[PDB]
């Protein structure tokens, strides 16, 4: 089976704004997660072909990854911080859905999610 095209990261027809919360999501949240020792499987779309997972895109219909999230942030693709937060949650929950409790990849996602939740708890108030 083929991989799907990666999620869209740019759309010239979308309105754009910068907010202190979206700036925080890029400068603090994404940066903190990216450098984590368990980040690397989440830094690009799942390549189901390379990984020989023919059923991955049969099961996961809303793929997401931190490479995509970062590009969306850099491109001012998001209008609301909540959109970006949803994309992180989609990434984590896709991992839990496809895989099984206790799997190494799940433990990796769990560590990132812990850190994510800590940083989102420190999200500054909308200015
Ligand atoms: C360079 O990339 C990899 C390389 C190798 C790699 O090189 N593995 C080697 C390990 C040692 N043997 C000897 C050869 C292959 C393994 C995994 C990689 N990448 C990856 N990215 C993302 C996911 C994932 N993997 N998952 C893992 C679970 C276990 C097998 C895929 C399952 C998943 F479903 F796709 C998933 O949810 N995510 C989040």
Curated annotation (Swiss-Prot):
Domain Bromo, chain residue ranges per copy: 17-123
Site (Acetylated histone binding): residue numbering on this chain: 99
Signal peptide (residue range): none
PTMs per UniProt: Phosphorylation by CK2 disrupt the intramolecular binding between the bromo domain 2 and the NPS region and promotes binding between the NPS and the BID regions, leading to activate the protein and promote binding to acetylated histones. In absence of phosphorylation, BRD4 does not localize to p53/TP53 target gene promoters, phosphorylation promoting recruitment to p53/TP53 target promoters.
Subcellular location as annotated: Nucleus; Chromosome
Transmembrane annotation, as ranges: none
Tissues expressed in: Ubiquitously expressed.
Consequence the record notes for mutating residue 104 to G: Found in a patient with a neurodevelopmental syndrome; uncertain significance
Cross-link type Glycyl lysine isopeptide (Lys-Gly) (interchain with G-Cter in SUMO2), residue numbers: 58
Domain notes: The NET domain mediates interaction with a number of chromatin proteins involved in transcription regulation (NSD3, JMJD6, CHD4, GLTSCR1 and ATAD5). The C-terminal (CTD) region mediates interaction and recruitment of CDK9 and CCNT1 subunits of the P-TEFb complex. It is also required for maintenance of higher-order chromatin structure.
Subunit structure and binding partners: Interacts with p53/TP53; the interaction is direct. Interacts (via CTD region) with CDK9 and CCNT1, acting as an associated component of P-TEFb complex. Interacts with RELA (when acetylated at 'Lys-310'). Interacts (via NET domain) with NSD3, CHD4, BICRA and ATAD5. The interaction with BICRA bridges BRD4 to the GBAF complex. Interacts (via NET domain) with JMJD6 (via JmjC and N-terminal domains); the interaction is stronger in presence of ssRNA and recruits JMJD6 on distal enhancers. Interacts with NSD3. Interacts with NIPBL.
Role, per record: Chromatin reader protein that recognizes and binds acetylated histones and plays a key role in transmission of epigenetic memory across cell divisions and transcription regulation. Remains associated with acetylated chromatin throughout the entire cell cycle and provides epigenetic memory for postmitotic G1 gene transcription by preserving acetylated chromatin status and maintaining high-order chromatin structure. During interphase, plays a key role in regulating the transcription of signal-inducible genes by associating with the P-TEFb complex and recruiting it to promoters.
Miscellaneous remark of the record: JQ1, a thieno-triazolo-1,4-diazepine derivative, and I-BET, a benzodiazepine derivative, have been tested on tumors with success. Treatment with GSK1210151A (I-BET151, a I-BET derivative) has strong effets on mixed lineage leukemia and promotes myeloid differentiation and leukemia stem-cell depletion.
Associated disorder: Cornelia de Lange syndrome 6: A form of Cornelia de Lange syndrome, a clinically heterogeneous developmental disorder associated with malformations affecting multiple systems. It is characterized by facial dysmorphisms, abnormal hands and feet, growth delay, cognitive retardation, hirsutism, gastroesophageal dysfunction and cardiac, ophthalmologic and genitourinary anomalies. CDLS6 inheritance is autosomal dominant. A chromosomal aberration involving BRD4 is found in a rare, aggressive, and lethal carcinoma arising in midline organs of young people. Translocation t(15;19)(q14;p13) with NUTM1 which produces a BRD4-NUTM1 fusion protein.
Record family assignment: Belongs to the BET family.
Protein name: Bromodomain-containing protein 4
Range covered out of full length: 44 to 168 of 1362
